[PDB]
């Protein structure tokens, strides 16, 4: 990591901080986003910092910031792309998918497969042993 990149991060990392206390605030982010023309809800503001944390304190710092800045700068990550395309067909949102609509969509919805491939796919990923298929476990297993 070049020192120029580190300085470029530290600049505009000192942003989101109207007091220079070396820490983040759930109100400083709201003020900054109001300055830029947005106004998210309190739950959304909480989730914005919740989706990147590793201590549970509700406060991140330079290491986590650099951790997230390492990504979000490249091209296709090949992980979020498969994280979505399940939620499209996932209705309730708990994280389970029935084993019949999967067959229906794979046999009907665009560049359809054949019966052999669908049967093989259903025979595979049978860790659960029930109709409720856990797509999250299918990820990190078919793409490990």
């Amino acid at each position: 990591l070049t020192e120029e990149q580190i300085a470029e991060f530290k600049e505009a990392f000192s942003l989101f901080d109207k007091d220079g206390d070396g820490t983040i605030t759930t109100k400083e982010l709201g003020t900054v986003m109001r300055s830029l023309g947005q106004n998210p809800t309190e739950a959304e503001l909480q989730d914005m910092i919740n989706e990147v944390d590793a201590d549970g304190n509700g406060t991140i710092d330079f290491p986590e910031f650099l951790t997230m800045m390492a990504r979000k700068m490249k091209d296709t990550d090949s992980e979020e792309e498969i994280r979505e395309a399940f939620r499209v067909f996932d209705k309730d949102g708990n994280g389970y998918i029935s084993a019949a609509e999967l067959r229906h969509v794979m046999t009907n919805l665009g560049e359809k497969l054949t019966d052999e491939e669908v049967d093989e796919m259903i025979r595979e990923a049978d860790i659960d042993g029930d109709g409720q298929v856990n797509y999250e476990e299918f990820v990190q297993m078919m793409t490990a």
């Binding site: 070049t2 990149q5 991060f9 505009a12 800045m69 979000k72 700068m73 490249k74 091209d75 090949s78």
Partner: protein, 272 residues
């Protein structure tokens, strides 16, 4: 991986700068050669070869630099998308654009001496005219297409569209930093400069192009006059008319049509 990315970025930028330097030299030498051939020396002199071998050498080096640049960008794609074989990055669109770049950049007036018959219908009197022209006139003018490298150099050298934090924020917002975005940004930051630079550049370029085309079938010094071409382009851009100056060749009419379309676009933009 950050060091590898930085090295690739630097190498790509340096290759772009060298390509621009080696293209502008060829354009300038072509301009000087065309100006001085209608005069001091003919096409059979030693100066003709002495000044076309320079053009050929510059073209060879330019082709080499472009190919190396494309190899570098394929390596950068492999690094970004996480691939191990280079054949994954080769789609039909990429091949088509690479071939188009090579074909456009590989035209120049080759050394030699060849002739050609040219018949034109004079304007306002409808009287035919026959001359004998040079094949270099068909090969030299298409060289103005090289001017697309200035856009690449300016885009790569811009500090506003290069900061890592801005790219990260744009990625978080799920937008792409393509050429439409940068064009739309400059059309709001400073539209006057954008509309002025392009007008002046097209102005001189087209005014010279009409004269270089039409000096062949012209004897009374009307459209072969630099200031006459400048006045013609000015009143065709603004849609006032033609006066008593009409091209005798289809090249002049094509240039005038391009000028008119660009003028209508610029007028609407200035209205906004």
């Amino acid at each position: 991986k950050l060091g590898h990315r930085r090295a690739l970025f630097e190498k790509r930028k340096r290759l772009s700068d060298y390509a621009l330097i080696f293209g502008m030299f060829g354009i300038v030498v072509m301009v000087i050669e065309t100006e001085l051939s209608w005069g001091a020396y003919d096409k059979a002199s030693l100066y003709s070869l002495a000044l076309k071998c320079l053009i050929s050498l510059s073209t060879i080096i330019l082709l080499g630099l472009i190919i190396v640049y494309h190899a570098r960008e394929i390596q950068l794609f492999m690094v970004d998308n996480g691939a191990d074989d280079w054949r994954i990055a080769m789609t039909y669109e990429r091949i088509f654009f690479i071939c188009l770049e090579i074909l456009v950049c590989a035209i120049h007036p080759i050394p030699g001496n060849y002739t050609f018959t040219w018949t034109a219908r004079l304007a306002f009197s409808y009287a035919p005219s026959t001359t004998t022209a040079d094949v270099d006139i068909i090969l030299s003018i298409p060289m103005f297409l090289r001017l697309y490298l200035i856009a690449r150099v300016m885009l790569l050298h811009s500090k506003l569209f290069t900061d890592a934090s801005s790219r990260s924020i744009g990625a978080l917002n799920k937008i792409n930093f393509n050429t439409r975005f940068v064009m739309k940004t400059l059309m709001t930051i400073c539209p006057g400069t954008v509309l002025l630079v392009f007008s002046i550049s097209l102005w001189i370029i087209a005014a010279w192009t009409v004269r270089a085309c039409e000096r062949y079938h012209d004897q009374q010094d009307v459209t072969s006059n630099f200031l006459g071409a400048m006045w013609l382009i000015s009143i065709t851009f603004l849609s006032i008319g033609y006066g008593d100056m009409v091209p005798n060749t289809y090249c002049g009419k094509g240039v005038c049509l391009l000028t008119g379309i660009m003028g209508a676009g610029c007028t609407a933009l200035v209205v906004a």
